[PDB]
Design a protein around this ligand. Structure first.
Ligand code: CLA
Ligand code: CLA
Ligand code: CLA
Ligand code: CLA
Ligand code: CLA
Ligand code: CLA
Ligand code: CLA
Ligand code: CLA
Ligand code: CLA
Ligand SMILES: CC1=C(/C=C/C(C)=C/C=C/C(C)=C\C=C\C=C(C)\C=C\C=C(C)\C=C\C2=C(C)CCCC2(C)C)C(C)(C)CCC1
Ligand code: SF4
Lengths: 159, 80, 43, 95, 69, 143, 33, 154, 100
């Protein structure tokens, strides 16, 4: 089912099973990157929580102090630092890409041709709310990963 | 963008513009040669700078001449 | 043949002939007169 | 019209022509619980001013970095532990 | 004038044009456009090509000078 | 005021199974250079975005990426298939600028009705040195 | 404290001054008036 | 004895180089029979080495502290066999090459398509010229006086 | 269906084209105005798809060129086997191959 995007052959993409399928499109459409209708703050919270855990993963066990007793604590600290930096670069991104009050640069159309509402994430205040959610969610996910490594160390692998 | 210029040594052979892939050039009438035509460059905004025009100018050095200048999205030849 | 000699006179064929003759010359000189650093005749 | 037989240049609907599509941008409503959403709103609205967020991030991160590197001892980083070893005399005496 | 204005067809000529490949080099006039409105009538034919593999070019009357030979 | 633009209508597009060399976000915020041509038969041609397309019998329409794409296509059309072509420029606001002949005639036939610009009435060596135009916007070649 | 000043200034300089500098310079790049 | 260099006929390290190379070639000589081709070739190389060292001794070469002949180029009459006599021997041949080539290019210059004579070398013409560079130091001098060596701009 | 379709005396054996270098191409078979010509004489030497447009002459050219390559490899193996025969220690290497 490799017919082009929206059946439009002169747009540079295709509706292959990987892009446009009932399972993978649904998955890419019901996650906080593409929830264009809900406010960007909850989206950013979800995103930051997930990436905070994903970053605390390869800092405790993989790192300069992984074998020491300071593995979990200092690794979570480095993960929170990387999260602060990611919110930092997200912030300069929101400042540089769109200024203060312009309308959303997101597409106001869908595959079915409906003149949907534009994604307010791409606005200034919207991206700022998204960055705030990302920072809050990321620090929270870092400390929760630290908590789970603390109180529930035995089921997880140490190696 | 780029500044294409046609000097008065042109013989009006229409190779500069038949080689130009971006419609930058066009032949106009003139009274300076046996062919009674000379090339002009109105659409320099569409000039990428490929110098196919001056790789086909059969003169002492050149008559058409491309000067590299402020590069925009269309002079840089970007589809994005 | 005129054209065979025209080809033998071409630059690579004549170059390899000339440098084979020359190389044989210098080779036989460095075999008959080996290990030469100074010109001793009327030295 | 964009929906005609192999017509992709609806000059009025330039979004469908140029490819402006939310390819996966579902406009479905908030699937989160309202109470936790309000909780996150009230607890992350401080991070709403991107400029204040950036100033806070840079300054507090630099402060925490200096604090960690100044209060950390040599047990967590060998550079602050010091030599704890006699110095080798270099070549030619020491020069 | 209706009579010839420039060098003769075959007159070996020198190029005073500083931007040409054959500057300070001799040539061979093959034609002279007798129209009294063209700017570079003197069609020369040189012996060695330029960088564009071209042996001929139009020159003016003041950008050309015949040799004593 | 002798040749009017053509104002391309909603014509059909060639049969093509879709590629990746098509229209990116440049079209969504800048021009994208529609081309229109008129085929005698349903024949097959190489697309400038890579891949083979099947042009339709009658008028066609292609919105590819940029000027060089449509002009390369049109040159291949005119030389290989001997077919009249004309292409445009479609800004995202809506305007459609006509560009390829701009006189109904291709830009090789020196047809009167076009004003000569980019025209320095001198040989190329008689341009002034840069010091003569130092600290001036004119670089070397606009006097 | 003199032995503790590199521990304050090197993490300060080589990480924050890149943060400040690269951020402010990216903002200066991506600007419009 | 100039430049702090002892001659090779009265040098110690030069004879030491000789002895060391001879012992090296003799160590590779006790692996074959003394009448077979390898041993005969090794003995020939040995005599070649010994005569080489003795010839460098008898020519008055100057061997430094490292024990190798250091050639003198300054112009000392004793050491014109080092640079100046072979230098003249070179320049005579090199100018032969240049002069026959130049007279060849001038010979084909009055051709319809001269370049084909640079590809397809006219061997009769060159062979009639190939010995004309024997007298290059006088023909070139006259072409310089007559004005035929250097071209005129026009 | 399959056959031995083969035509006789298509090309003449003659040194006439040896004397005219660059004969195979149009721009090269007129003379060296420049030195690049000789580089184009070797570059396009085996570019038979550019010399002609029909695949028949190209196929014949590459077939006989493969024959020349096989001649070269047979001559190379001749050299190797010969040098083994005359200028080698193979007759001695069989005795003590782990040390010779
Ligand atoms: C270390 C890398 C890394 C990891 C592990 C994750 C992990 C995740 N991200 Mg994040 N993300 C990253 C980098 C990363 N991200 C970067 C660099 C960006 C900037 C573009 C984002 C922007 C982003 C957004 C905006 C969102 C996520 C989301 C997610 C979650 C689910 C969607 C997903 O990743 O699958 C989808 C994967 C793809 C689309 C990539 C497909 C490419 C091929 C087919 C896969 C190849 C994988 C193979 C092993 C190699 C998951 C927790 C979502 C989330 O947080 O939900 C809670 C969400 O909405 N990510
Ligand atoms: C270098 C790779 C790496 C490493 C060493 C770790 C290491 C760890 N991960 Mg992470 N993780 C990674 C990549 C990595 N992760 C990636 C790519 C994903 C998918 C995006 C995850 C998703 C993940 C989850 C979902 C969880 C972990 C958890 C953990 C911990 C226990 C796992 C048992 C451990 C600290 C668990 C934990 O709670 O950490 C303390 C946990 O729940 N990891
Ligand atoms: C030039 C200045 C500079 C300085 C001072 C540091 C300092 C450090 N680096 Mg290095 N690094 C640098 C440049 C620098 N980096 C560059 C240019 C690169 C790329 C080549 C790296 C790549 C690198 C890697 C790959 C790793 C380090 C690691 C480390 C830590 C030492 C490991 C250890 O034993 O302590 C152990 C100390 C800890 C586990 C605690 C970490 C403290 C965190 C980061 C402070 C959080 C503060 C704040 C919230 C975020 C920063 C704010 C921002 C404005 C700067 C230390 C914090 C290691 C590390 O720990 O990083 C995770 C490590 O794995 N660095
Ligand atoms: C440019 C640098 C350079 C220089 C100056 C030399 C110089 C020399 N090398 Mg070295 N060499 C070099 C580069 C150089 N080489 C390179 C790059 C390589 C690697 C390819 C070698 C490899 C090499 C080896 C392996 C050997 C040398 C040898 C020699 C010596 C040659 C003596 C000889 O046989 O000539 C004698 C003269 C001739 C061959 C020319 C004869 C010319 C004919 C007869 C015409 C002249 C007569 C004519 C009719 C005019 C007469 C007068 C009258 C009629 C008018 C000499 C010291 C050999 C040697 O003995 O080392 C000391 C030696 O074994 N060289
Ligand atoms: C261009 C001249 C120069 C250079 C190349 C350096 C280079 C360095 N200095 Mg020094 N420094 C300088 C001038 C310089 N310093 C001056 C003029 C002062 C007095 C204000 C200092 C005071 C100073 C302190 C107090 C410290 C350094 C440190 C350092 C190191 C890390 C960079 C840093 O944090 O510096 C910070 C320097 C400044 C903010 C002064 C800029 C003016 C590095 C080897 C650190 C160190 O010892 O690491 C080993 C450290 O703790 N510098
Ligand atoms: C010896 C007799 C002979 C003669 C007189 C001819 C004459 C001719 N042949 Mg024929 N040919 C011959 C033998 C001969 N051929 C053989 C034995 C083969 C099989 C390989 C061919 C295969 C052949 C083909 C496929 C073609 C010709 C063509 C031609 C014509 C032009 C050839 C030319 O100018 O290039 C002269 C080229 C050379 C003199 C050199 C060629 C290279 C040789 C074969 C091998 C080089 C080996 C060498 C050691 C490798 C390099 C390494 C080195 C650096 C150490 C001409 C009519 C062409 C023709 O008519 O098309 C218009 C053509 O297409 N010939
Ligand atoms: C089955 C093997 C095979 C065959 C039949 C061909 C045949 C051809 N190739 Mg292909 N090719 C091959 C292998 C092969 N090639 C390999 C292995 C490579 C990787 C490098 C290439 C890369 C390649 C490119 C990039 C191009 C070709 C081209 C060509 C065509 C013309 C070549 C020509 O005229 O040069 C004739 C022969 C020469 C010019 C001599 C080459 C000189 C070599 C590099 C000398 C140095 C190598 C040597 C071993 C080192 C010793 C040095 C010593 C002499 C001092 C011809 C159709 C060209 C083409 O079709 O143009 C349109 C082209 O552009 N080939
Ligand atoms: C049993 C039949 C047979 C055999 C043995 C071969 C063998 C070979 N063919 Mg093939 N060929 C055959 C049938 C056969 N062919 C048929 C029926 C056709 C027509 C469709 C072709 C068309 C064909 C083309 C177009 C080409 C080959 C090539 C080759 C050579 C490839 C290089 C190689 O591996 O060298 C290994 C070398 C050997 C095995 C040495 C064998 C020496 C004998 C004498 C020649 C092969 C037997 C020969 C077919 C008999 C013909 C009768 C003759 C005695 C009068 C190889 C010699 C290629 C080649 O190299 O060109 C020269 C090539 O370009 N052949
Ligand atoms: C790939 C093919 C190949 C290669 C690279 C060599 C290479 C060599 N051969 Mg061998 N040879 C070959 C094929 C080959 N041969 C074949 C097919 C024969 C049979 C006719 C011979 C018969 C042969 C003899 C009889 C001798 C050599 C010798 C030599 C050497 C010097 C040749 C020389 O300068 O001739 C002179 C140069 C020209 C004629 C030009 C050299 C190592 C000589 C050697 O090894 O000396 C000890 C030697 O005496 N070869
Ligand atoms: C003695 C000596 C020395 C020194 C020397 C010197 C210093 C010299 C100089 C010299 C010089 C200072 C020179 C100059 C010259 C110049 C010129 C100017 C020339 C010219 C020439 C010509 C032109 C030629 C030509 C030719 C010929 C003849 C050959 C071949 C051909 C030709 C044609 C190439 C020493 C001690 C070191 C060592 C020993 C020896
Ligand atoms: S290529 Fe040069 S000479 Fe020919 S028409 Fe164009 S400008 Fe004139």
């Amino acid at each position: 089912v490799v017919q082009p995007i929206n059946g439009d052959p002169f747009i540079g993409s295709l509706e292959t099973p990987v892009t446009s399928s009932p399972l993978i499109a649904w998955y890419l459409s019901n996650l906080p990157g593409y929830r264009t209708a809900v406010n960007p703050l909850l989206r950013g919270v979800e995103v930051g929580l997930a990436h905070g855990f994903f970053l605390v993963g390869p800092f405790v066990k993989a790192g300069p102090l992984r074998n020491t007793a300071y593995a979990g604590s200092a690794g979570s600290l480095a993960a929170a630092g990387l999260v602060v930096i990611l919110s930092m670069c997200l912030t300069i991104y929101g400042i540089s890409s769109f200024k203060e009050g312009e309308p959303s640069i997101a597409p106001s159309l869908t595959l079915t041709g409906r003149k949907k509402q534009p994604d307010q994430l791409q606005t200034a205040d919207g991206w700022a709310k998204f960055t705030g959610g990302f920072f809050f969610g990321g620090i929270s996910g870092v400390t929760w990963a630290y908590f789970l490594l603390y109180v529930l160390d035995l089921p997880y692998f140490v190696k | 963008s780029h500044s294409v210029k046609i000097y008065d040594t042109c013989i009006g052979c229409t190779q500069c513009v038949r080689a130009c892939p971006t419609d930058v050039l066009e032949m106009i009438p003139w009274d300076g040669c046996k062919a009674k035509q000379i090339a002009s460059a109105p659409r320099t905004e569409d000039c990428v700078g490929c110098k196919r025009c001056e790789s086909a100018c059969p003169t002492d050095f050149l008559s058409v001449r491309v000067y590299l200048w402020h590069e925009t999205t269309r002079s840089m030849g970007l589809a994005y | 043949m005129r054209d065979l000699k025209t080809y033998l006179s071409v630059a690579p064929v004549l170059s390899t002939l000339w440098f084979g003759s020359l190389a044989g010359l210098l080779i036989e000189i460095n075999r008959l007169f080996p290990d030469a650093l100074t010109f001793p005749f009327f030295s | 019209k964009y929906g005609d037989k192999s017509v992709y240049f609806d000059l009025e609907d330039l979004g469908n022509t140029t490819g402006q599509w939310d390819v996966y941008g579902s406009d479905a409503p908030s699937p989160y619980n309202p109470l936790q959403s309000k909780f996150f709103e009230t607890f992350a609205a401080p991070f709403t001013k991107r400029g204040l967020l950036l100033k806070f991030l840079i300054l507090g991160g630099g402060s925490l970095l200096t604090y960690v590197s100044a209060n950390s001892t040599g047990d967590v980083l060998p550079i602050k532990r010091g030599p704890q070893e006699p110095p080798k005399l270099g070549p030619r005496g020491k020069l | 004038k209706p009579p010839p204005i420039g060098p003769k067809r075959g007159s070996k000529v020198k190029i005073l044009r500083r931007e040409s490949y054959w500057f300070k080099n001799v040539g061979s006039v093959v034609a002279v456009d007798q129209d009294p409105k063209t700017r570079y009538p003197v069609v020369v034919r040189f012996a060695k090509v330029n960088y564009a593999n071209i042996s001929t070019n139009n020159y003016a009357l003041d950008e050309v000078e015949e040799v004593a030979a | 005021g002798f040749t009017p633009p053509q104002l391309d209508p909603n014509t059909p597009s060639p049969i093509f199974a879709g590629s990746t060399g098509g229209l990116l976000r440049k079209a969504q915020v800048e021009e994208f250079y529609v081309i229109t041509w008129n085929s005698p038969k349903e024949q097959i041609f190489e697309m400038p975005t890579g891949g083979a397309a099947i042009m339709r019998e009658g008028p066609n329409l292609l919105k590819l990426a940029r000027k060089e794409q449509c002009l390369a296509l049109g040159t291949r059309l005119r030389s290989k298939y001997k077919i009249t072509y004309q292409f445009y420029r479609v800004f995202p606001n809506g305007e459609v600028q006509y560009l390829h002949p701009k006189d109904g005639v291709y830009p090789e036939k020196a047809n009167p009705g076009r004003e000569g610009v980019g025209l320095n009435m001198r040989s190329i060596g008689k341009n002034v040195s840069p010091i003569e135009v130092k600290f001036t916007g004119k670089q070397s070649y606009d006097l | 404290t003199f032995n503790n000043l590199p521990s304050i200034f090197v993490p300060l300089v080589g990480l924050v001054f890149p943060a400040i500098a690269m951020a402010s310079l990216f903002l200066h790049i991506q600007k419009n008036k | 004895d100039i430049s702090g260099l002892t001659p090779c006929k009265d040098s110690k390290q030069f004879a030491k180089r000789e002895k060391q190379q001879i012992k090296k070639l003799e160590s590779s000589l006790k692996l074959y029979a003394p009448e077979s081709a390898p041993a005969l070739a090794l003995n020939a190389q040995i005599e070649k080495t010994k005569r080489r060292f003795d010839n460098y001794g008898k020519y008055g070469l100057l061997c430094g502290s490292d024990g190798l002949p250091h050639l003198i180029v300054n112009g000392d009459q004793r050491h014109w066999g080092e640079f100046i006599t072979p230098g003249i021997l070179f320049l005579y041949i090199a100018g032969w090459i240049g002069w026959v080539g130049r007279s060849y290019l001038i010979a084909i210059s009055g051709e319809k398509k001269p370049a084909m004579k640079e590809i397809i070398i006219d061997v009769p013409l060159a062979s009639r010229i190939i010995f004309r560079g024997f007298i290059w130091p006088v023909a070139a001098y006259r072409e310089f006086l007559n004005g035929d060596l250097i071209a005129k701009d026009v | 269906e399959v056959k031995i379709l083969v035509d006789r005396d298509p090309i003449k054996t003659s040194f006439e084209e040896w004397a005219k270098p660059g004969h195979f191409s149009r721009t090269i078979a007129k003379g060296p105005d420049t030195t690049t010509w000789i580089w184009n004489l070797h570059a396009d030497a085996h570019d038979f798809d550019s010399h002609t447009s029909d695949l028949e002459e190209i196929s014949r050219k590459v077939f006989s060129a493969h024959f020349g390559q096989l001649s070269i490899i047979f001559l190379w193996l001749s050299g190797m086997y010969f040098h083994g025969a005359r200028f080698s220690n193979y007759e001695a290497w069989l005795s003590d191959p782990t040390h010779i």
